[model samples]
Target chain A: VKVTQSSRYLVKRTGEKVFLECVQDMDHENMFWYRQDPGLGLRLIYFSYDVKMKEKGDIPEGYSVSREKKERFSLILESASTNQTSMYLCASSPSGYQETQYFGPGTRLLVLEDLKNVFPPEVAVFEPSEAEISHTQKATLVCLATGFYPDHVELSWWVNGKEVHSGVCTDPQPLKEQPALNDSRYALSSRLRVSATFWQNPRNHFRCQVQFYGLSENDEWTQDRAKPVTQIVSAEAWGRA
Target chain B: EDKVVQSPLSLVVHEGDTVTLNCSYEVTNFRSLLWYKQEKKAPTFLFMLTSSGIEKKSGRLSSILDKKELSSILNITATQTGDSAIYLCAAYNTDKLIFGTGTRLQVFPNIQNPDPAVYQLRDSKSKSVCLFTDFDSQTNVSQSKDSDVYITDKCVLDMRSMDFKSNSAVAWSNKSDFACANAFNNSIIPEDTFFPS
Candidate 1:
């Protein structure tokens, strides 16, 4: 008669493993998971099966889940991330493509930055390519995301730990499904245009981080459930060769 | 060998200028043609043309392919600053995808000088190659201890020397441009050692 999520609000430190438990007593054969963000509609994180397990989630990076019994489903964020902070929703269905799914109130996952156990990636600067020269002192820095199942990702740029918007342009339309890497995995690129020499002062840390999701073809507004980011040291390729 | 090329390498025009970016390709077993407005934002799909000479238009832009000639043209009428970005032309077949270097378009404000000499001095930089490598699985990938993955040339150059002792050391050598890079697991590889086939 009802679907339940263990926590309505949960807080975890960045890089800390977190768990989400959703239990339904209606004896539904199917269950689903996704998240919501204003900039992006709804994207699937994972999809479930009747009994044991069915493997396939739109955004499965940085996450894993389990189901011991049909009445219970759990979502695991292996290594907690700041971008993983959002509204997480759980649902259960009697079963079918069109069946209405019962909903859980939702869990607001907040991962604060403790900087405790960082991912430990080498700290360095990312430079713009010399070839981008001559087109103008303004250079284009590309952020690419690939090997993802569903092709929906929110690409954001950060420099010195702050979000930047100057010269930021993203597609406003739905993504197209093209044949890619492994048939299931897809590729996308995001460009950040900036003053060629502006960021060249040895540079601040810059990153092209991505949060993925799934929906449209499968279940709920499927929030691709993986947080995969690429951070760079130097923002500008800077000046000249 | 599959090849794709885009021309008018870069163009600067006034707001009202109508531009036609061109692309030519030579590939065996060609299947379909695709056009994308490539940028640092979301990847926007413009057109996927399978039939030759049939123009696909949406709003102010349209695209068409000539299968017999192995070429295509993208027309953007009443260009605006929004139209300024890299137009990616790709030839896709069962074997692989061949993307052109791309045509760069710059639409200046109408109030600016229309003279190419005055406007040409804008030292704009084009696109740079940033490799895509990401995964969310639990198991160790690419022989690296941790599951973290990386494939960008910029990051590879940045983390080239540092040894991935305790954390993950993942890098892919799929692109010929990255011919020198290999899987990073236990230690670091001197940049001087990676080379040609």
Candidate 2:
């Protein structure tokens, strides 16, 4: 297995403590932390390997970090602030430069004065615009989170009041920022695919939930029942008519 | 500091021409030299030079490293419009890679011209000879039909028109890659090797 990130979006205060964790199941011998700004490019912050030893990189200012277990590495932000706001990415590889390095979903942390007052993300469920459902084909359901600031949120799916985690679900796609006019905000969409039999059942339900700051809730666009095949056939027939 | 330098910052040539790009570097704990071609988004890796005097070739593009000189040259023959790109060179400094500012090579189409030199060379000499003449003279004779004179003619005209004795000489310094690697022996920490403090 490869490494994965704990959280996507994280919020903190000026003097607050922050911990970013990364886990690798493949027992990778090397791990690294890199930070990127607009024009400055990616700068190496810290590196660690097996036996739990660490070394500071070129830009280690105002940052004290550590790595404990061989398979786990953690980056601690002692006192966070606005200037520390940027994409923090974590990567791991075997012991050689030629080996493939695996990366995690970046954690975007924002240190603000009133973190609680920030607006929560707007979550909506979108169906694939086309209605060409096939038997062995997987129908995709998209959970779109937009009009969000500080750009950090968690997403999951529920089937009939039960949390679903399987091959049908995928990691959330990286956040897509709107154009320049909507600066400092972004949108993200995650997809969940289910069989036509699972979706066509009248008794089944699908829901999407998002968590941000300290508030967490499942939004309103939950699908209580799959639309019948007759409705889809008639809709397509009407479009042609 | 890990240093990589590339010369002839930019070059322009007509289609069917050949160009040799130069890259020299000084880095600590040197492992290999790498070449890349940058067209737009990401640079595609071309070659990694580890041993000296070994030529790595692919079609019309080839590169060789000279450990004795601490430098490498990338040779491109029969260049076309698609070969127009910024060629980047980097040296592996033990743990990380240090890159040099790339050399931009613009290959233009071999436009037809009535320059007697351009067509005469094509008619009288082999393609390889014409290419060698253009490369050694550092001239775009193939591009213009007006350039009909031979290399001897150009040399004779230069000697008759200008004073050679008053020209100032420039001195260049050559440094070895091993010397650089030794200097950074204590400074750069290897990936597998670590310090307690």
Candidate 3:
């Protein structure tokens, strides 16, 4: 098996013909995980090692694993070939059952005669705060569409379910880097700074829309959305006491 | 038991033909659908769909989601020789994803050419070899690096993302660190290119 410098980030194993992936954390974090982002289902947990030398069954564990040593587990296959097969699996569940799981980017596999693409469409949105605001105050909104691939993407702001073409602003690009999964990726963000004057109605709703290309098949496409945001900026009227 | 299955595991077509690939999944907590294209070192990014019935479009390619059917379809039109590649389908449940075996498609050239051959020396002492003729630029340069004399008669590398033989046996010796968006969420996109040894 070959290991990358970030032992906790990328791990792989090779025996006779099979290949495996693993990860370790120095903080003694109790969750180990593995995944193939483009495969058909997430419940096919492959193989996971729990505790020291303990083996447990996942929802649809399809492969075999060995935890012969602490801080180590091996996924094995009888034969290996250069083909466009699904992801080979490996994982560790360190914490009791409810703790979070940490994943080792992933290993890229391909059949010799084929070319394939897998795209992950993702989106998220956040605001500064939701506290009550005066009619004179301002509201700032931020929207993020991360994990959508092929670089070519479009995002826009919406008001009351209608496209808000004006006053929409977006960063040049979302923070992008390869975290060991499998494809060139980035996070896209759009921001809108609205003044209390724009919210003439306290019940106005704002939304964000994201669109992008697909990797799996030619002509494939994907999209996602962030939760709708509402504006409640209003001024209270009271007579002098 | 969760399963992700794809149809027509392999396909072949002529340039300018239209093709469609399919993906279906069975999972407990359905979060989203993901797609990818694999050529050489890594799988390239494509699309991710979370909602139902929304058409995601770009150029001649397009895809739509069907939550009620638990499936998706990828459509490509006016296929070119460069369009020949594998199509992948995956289903997401929270932070984790299960992938389908890929479908391979080949676009034949109008003028038939000899197939390409690729070989590598597994051990230090083993000799590398080339088994085919047709001294094209790619094959000539690749064959020149081979130390053995193995011959390949039906092998070729499509010029897409990168050359596959550039780094055949690259291995990792230490652990690498990778941050995850979520545990059950299985969308890991690559940010770096693999270095050749």
TM-scores for every candidate against the unseen true structure: 0.32, 0.44, 0.35
Count of clashing pairs, candidate 2: 5
* Candidate 3 residue spans exceeding 4 A from truth: A1-241, B40-42, B58-60, B80-84, B112-150, B157-197
Off by over 4 Å in 1: A1-241, B112-197
Off by over 4 Å in 2: A96-101, A125-144, A153-241, B1-28, B32-91, B97-197
Question: Which digits, one per residue and each the tens of the lDDT, describe model 3 over residues B59-126?
Answer: 65677779899888887788765565677676767545566777787764332332222111121111
10 residues in a row with least lDDT, candidate 1 chain A: A115-124
Per-residue lDDT for A143-171 in model 2, tens only? 55554555555567676777775523322
Error of 3 at B60 (Å): 4.5
The TM-score between candidate 1 and the true structure equals 0.32
Reference-based lDDT, each prediction:
0.54, 0.53, 0.43
Instruction: Give a tens-digit lDDT track for model 3, residues A1-241.
Output: 2221121111111222444545454322233334344433233334333445433435324445555544555554444343324443333334332122333434443322211233334554443222212311433344555544434455777776667644444543344434444554655545444554454344666666665533322222343433111111111111111
Clashing residue pairs in all predictions, respectively, total 28, 5, 72
| Cα shift from native, residue B42, model 3 (Å) | 4.5
